[PDB]
């Protein structure tokens, strides 16, 4: 039995996790959902509790906690431990009946839970890549202290890369640890991208694309923020840095490749030059599922890949002139220090402005470029708590700087 | 330092093995070529001996044995053990100073060295699919007895499949052992094929193809016999049965896919429906190398795959009407018993007839089909040597039968 907690259980990743768990458990009873944690959606948590009957329930919003207790009374033969706020989150993390925790919470709250999962030596199925991009240093330090803690990637390209590895080697190291590449004989990564909706556009057409254009025909079902990032290819830029940190691959050895059919999810080139790749329909259930079964696999009733029907797969290089966010990402990542934090934070702002029709496509990369240019390297704290504060402070500064640039721009 | 013997060193597999060995050794000293064995090409063996200076030399044909000595006399500072025939082959296989044996003698003669390599508990890097097809059950029996022997596949599609597997699972089983696919969580195999030169021919055009046509512009550089089998897709038919025996995959779960770019070498679908595939340019050096380094990989300086340049990859189902040898292979595999032995033997004859312009394209399948039709199942001998004799008997019968059908037809 695999004992799993889901943090952010009503979000996109959390609901998809519960769905694949539900379907796999119908084939063979494999998963015990031990804990559910949601922010404010008390009715939804009740509905999930009702079905999965976890040992622990936690609602963050303290205002709705009594309500939740009332609701859950109505579930027969069920007496969970019902908690609330950060304190309930920490109690769940410390439970020895939980082996794996899905982090389906974004933003800072997600980093805080991640930290507690790591501090409790858990397997952390991490779907918030922004924490890896912005706080990579902090997570690396934390994983060095907590030896048995492991981050398993859920972002599809990174899951794919992870799935292309030999677990006989993987088990001698772990993600976000120096030497992961050496131990796994990794030479190079092909990081695949859908390319978004603008691949064939000229620079003059790109100048006038709108967020309505950007949210059209996404190849995956996803939130607005990531969909804008897909259109600018900043999503892939961020994913380049995620790759560097998870797998200890040099920036030079990470190649972004536009694969519009979204069947090959990424590929790993090993030192002999043999390449291995992972393929499936664009469906988040596979990467989520693997993060819960690794190092095993279990039976599903997902539709099998029909290669003959797919028929054709295509690959081309992205143009850095048309997708300058990609260049900025490499530049920030290579510079290192806290430039990735700055890149991520300034993009948060620039992305939202474009989403809301306040700036134009090349304004996004312009703003980000300017914030990056304004930032001066800071000495990296050795102290873990000081380091975390540095990251938050720089993140906050970068958001304000991005906003100030927008505000001062006519 | 890996100690290697090459059986059939002057064939396409052998020369490719020496080349990748030579190149890897220029990076770092990794392989010792301990032994070279050829059927009768003295001048070529002598050139190989001059460069690699192996401890052992073996020429099967004794009529050219003294000639070999006379040639090797010339090489200075070099006093190798110069053996001949089956006896020298046996002496090489049982030497302690040999860890891995590359079998690149495809002729059913290669069965013998395969056997002796297994009997001496070696790692057998096997590129003689005919022995697996004809004697699979026998080899399985032998591997059950010799617990430390391992067959590592060299045939490119089977190396690909093997490379897509998690060695943390592989090491709990071995090729040609019951339950290999269960232990490795294998649901299905996409067995890729170049398709040969005749994929786009109509039925009428196919009726007329000659061996000249078939040997034209092939996607891989190999011997005539396999190049003809590639044209008829009987090579893929044999490889279906090879897949069944190596990995214990049901015939129902093996799908042949025509992939004309020859970049994806085959794919594995796991029980969760995730697919993993192995890719490289069409170059036998990678699968050979992996068989010699498994469970590890080592650095090469081979050209890195450039996916963007390759640009497009395509997949389609083969037409069984155009390629009836595929259907015959499945039918023989599904029936089991000694039908694969008969399939392989009859094809040896039919292939050579076509190669030599004695029969037509559809005469190949017709002959094979008729020989299969004329065979009745036999009691499988439980004694291992009785079983070998049975296999040689039936193989020899099937060749005679196929020759008779040809001789009697106008
Ligand atoms: C699934 N996954 O891991 C993603 O990163 C989804 C991205 C893919 P990309 O950045 O366009 O390559 C995406 C595509 C389309 C719309 C929104 C996001
Ligand atoms: C490399 N390898 O493992 C082979 O089986 C070579 C075959 C490939 P196929 O049977 O055409 O798919 C082949 C293709 C073209 C010419 C000769 C052989
Ligand atoms: Cl999302
Ligand atoms: Mn992604
Ligand atoms: Mn092959």
Short mmCIF file of C-alpha atoms in Angstrom, two decimals, chain A residues 163-164 166-169 171 185 190 255 257 264 267 269-280 286 289 295-305 307-308 311-317, chain B residues 163-164 166-169 171 185 190 257 264 267 269-280 286 289-290 295-305 307-308 311-317:
data_model
loop_
_atom_site.label_atom_id
_atom_site.label_comp_id
_atom_site.label_asym_id
_atom_site.label_seq_id
_atom_site.Cartn_x
_atom_site.Cartn_y
_atom_site.Cartn_z
CA UNK A 163 11.29 8.25 -16.06
CA UNK A 164 14.13 7.92 -18.60
CA UNK A 166 17.89 3.86 -14.54
CA UNK A 167 16.59 3.53 -10.98
CA UNK A 168 19.50 1.30 -10.12
CA UNK A 169 21.52 4.57 -10.45
CA UNK A 171 18.69 5.16 -5.87
CA UNK A 185 25.57 9.16 -16.71
CA UNK A 190 16.22 17.60 -24.73
CA UNK A 255 18.35 22.10 -25.27
CA UNK A 257 13.07 21.84 -28.59
CA UNK A 264 7.43 13.08 -26.51
CA UNK A 267 14.53 13.03 -23.70
CA UNK A 269 21.08 11.85 -23.80
CA UNK A 270 23.50 9.62 -21.88
CA UNK A 271 27.33 9.84 -22.10
CA UNK A 272 27.52 7.12 -24.78
CA UNK A 273 25.17 9.32 -26.84
CA UNK A 274 22.25 6.94 -26.58
CA UNK A 275 19.00 8.85 -26.00
CA UNK A 276 15.95 7.70 -24.04
CA UNK A 277 12.58 9.41 -24.06
CA UNK A 278 9.20 9.23 -22.46
CA UNK A 279 6.02 9.47 -24.53
CA UNK A 280 2.30 9.67 -23.89
CA UNK A 286 1.01 9.96 -15.83
CA UNK A 289 1.04 8.86 -10.98
CA UNK A 295 10.38 3.49 -8.15
CA UNK A 296 7.55 1.12 -9.18
CA UNK A 297 4.78 1.35 -11.76
CA UNK A 298 1.17 0.21 -11.38
CA UNK A 299 -1.66 -0.74 -13.70
CA UNK A 300 -3.99 1.93 -15.09
CA UNK A 301 -6.88 1.95 -17.53
CA UNK A 302 -5.63 5.01 -19.41
CA UNK A 303 -5.99 4.98 -23.17
CA UNK A 304 -2.92 3.38 -24.76
CA UNK A 305 -0.74 5.49 -27.02
CA UNK A 307 1.63 5.66 -32.43
CA UNK A 308 0.32 4.78 -35.88
CA UNK A 311 1.49 9.16 -37.23
CA UNK A 312 3.88 12.14 -37.21
CA UNK A 313 6.13 13.80 -34.62
CA UNK A 314 7.97 17.06 -35.33
CA UNK A 315 10.94 18.89 -33.78
CA UNK A 316 12.43 22.31 -34.33
CA UNK A 317 14.49 24.90 -32.51
CA UNK B 163 17.62 0.11 -22.67
CA UNK B 164 14.06 1.35 -21.93
CA UNK B 166 14.75 0.01 -15.29
CA UNK B 167 17.85 -2.00 -14.32
CA UNK B 168 16.58 -2.00 -10.73
CA UNK B 169 13.98 -4.41 -12.13
CA UNK B 171 18.62 -7.22 -12.21
CA UNK B 185 5.99 -4.01 -15.65
CA UNK B 190 6.25 -1.28 -30.20
CA UNK B 257 5.43 -0.24 -36.45
CA UNK B 264 13.41 5.48 -32.64
CA UNK B 267 9.41 1.47 -27.56
CA UNK B 269 4.61 0.52 -22.98
CA UNK B 270 4.44 -0.05 -19.24
CA UNK B 271 1.32 -1.19 -17.33
CA UNK B 272 0.54 2.43 -16.38
CA UNK B 273 0.50 3.21 -20.16
CA UNK B 274 3.58 5.43 -20.04
CA UNK B 275 5.86 4.72 -22.98
CA UNK B 276 9.65 4.82 -23.01
CA UNK B 277 11.69 4.67 -26.21
CA UNK B 278 15.34 4.57 -27.23
CA UNK B 279 16.76 6.77 -29.98
CA UNK B 280 19.90 7.30 -31.99
CA UNK B 286 25.37 1.87 -29.63
CA UNK B 289 28.41 -0.97 -26.75
CA UNK B 290 25.49 -1.19 -24.31
CA UNK B 295 24.35 -2.26 -16.42
CA UNK B 296 26.58 0.79 -16.92
CA UNK B 297 27.21 3.29 -19.71
CA UNK B 298 30.57 4.81 -20.73
CA UNK B 299 31.59 7.92 -22.66
CA UNK B 300 31.81 7.88 -26.44
CA UNK B 301 32.58 10.58 -28.98
CA UNK B 302 29.89 9.45 -31.38
CA UNK B 303 27.98 12.20 -33.17
CA UNK B 304 25.21 13.52 -30.87
CA UNK B 305 21.66 13.11 -32.11
CA UNK B 307 16.55 16.06 -33.26
CA UNK B 308 15.89 19.45 -34.79
CA UNK B 311 12.97 17.24 -37.82
CA UNK B 312 10.27 14.64 -38.49
CA UNK B 313 9.56 11.13 -37.24
CA UNK B 314 6.77 9.01 -38.74
CA UNK B 315 4.89 5.83 -37.83
CA UNK B 316 2.52 3.53 -39.64
CA UNK B 317 1.22 -0.04 -39.52
#
